[PDB]
Amino acid sequence: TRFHSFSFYELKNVTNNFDERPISVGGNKMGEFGVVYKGYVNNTTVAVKKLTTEELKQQFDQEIKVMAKCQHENLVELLGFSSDGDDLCLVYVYMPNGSLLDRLSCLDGTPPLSWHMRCKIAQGAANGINFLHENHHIHRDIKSANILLDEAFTAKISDFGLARASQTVMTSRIVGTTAYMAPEALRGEITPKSDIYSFGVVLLEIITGLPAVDEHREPQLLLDIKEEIEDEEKTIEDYIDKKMNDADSTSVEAMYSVASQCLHEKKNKRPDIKKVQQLLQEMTA
Ligand SMILES: Cc1nc2cc(-c3ccn[nH]3)c(NC(=O)c3cccc(C(F)(F)F)n3)cc2n1C
């Protein structure tokens, strides 16, 4: 439709024959169910994601199905694709500032995100999840690594390969990232309410600047700090990222309130994305 059909050979020419060397050393590999390569079509920089074989083809076809129906400022934009043999490629609009994970970790010496930018990213990401949920899709892998940032640090949700259409069902194949996954999701339930839980973990990543899981940490899983703060063992202020100078307590506590609500172990007691949107909008009012 709107999507250009590339040959693998065209995308090989765009990506310097899919140079797996990092962009920093002069290759085309930017990040990693596949590797994301930098591409040049004319005067447009693009991101080329090269991905069981029939199950990969389903994730490919799903991404195209979702990206065909879902177009929104807080979602990545598919420019085209390539289906030539056992080599499946998806071409998107280039995101100059990479993933939220990378920027929260200040990877490659990038400056720390201000509270103001962090609040806009949270709102953007929420607006993107709202669009997917309004259009009866469940992401099933909402994480900081799947939230990409454009030139204006506008949040764009990515990776809809495992996305499901939405009456809560169950699955034999349990997918997602443990550190972000809700209890029912880990048990095989498929609900948009599980996406909310995962976002709660992302809101804690934004507040703390800490990764969802760290082997050499206590607690190892970031979601466990909710208990420490509820059992008055620690405070939110003890966990607030020290790499910010513009974080007012009222606003940080307000985002934690949403994160805590999002992270209710009872699916039905979690807020819907529309409420998450409203609460985060009120936070910046
Ligand atoms: C310095 C730097 N690091 C980067 C990391 C990624 C990155 C992290 C994880 N996947 N891709 C990235 N991604 C994209 O441009 C992009 C854009 C749209 C869609 C995708 C898709 F493939 F994920 F669907 N990727 C750009 C990056 N830049 C410019």
Residue numbers in the entry: 163 to 194, 197 to 215, 222 to 336, 341 to 459
Q: What's the paper's own text on this?
A:
Interleukin-1 receptor-associated kinase 4 (IRAK4) is ubiquitously expressed and is a central regulator of the innate immune system. Upon binding of the respective ligand, TLRs (except TLR3) and receptors of the IL-1 (IL-1R) family signal via IRAK4. In this process, ligand–receptor binding is associated with recruitment of myeloid differentiation primary response 88 (MyD88) protein to the receptor, where it interacts with IRAK4 forming the myddosome. In summary, IRAK4 appears to be indispensable in TLR/IL-1R signaling, and activation of the IRAK4 pathway is associated with inflammatory and autoimmune disorders such as atopic dermatitis, lupus erythematosus, hidradenitis suppurativa, and rheumatoid arthritis.
Further SAR exploration (details not shown) led to the identification of compound 41, which exhibited reasonable potency and good selectivity against FLT3 despite lacking a larger front pocket substituent. Compound 41 inhibited CYP3A4 (IC50 = 2 μM) to some extent and was therefore deprioritized for further optimization. Its cocrystal structure shows the pyrazole ring in a tilted orientation relative to the methylbenzimidazole core.
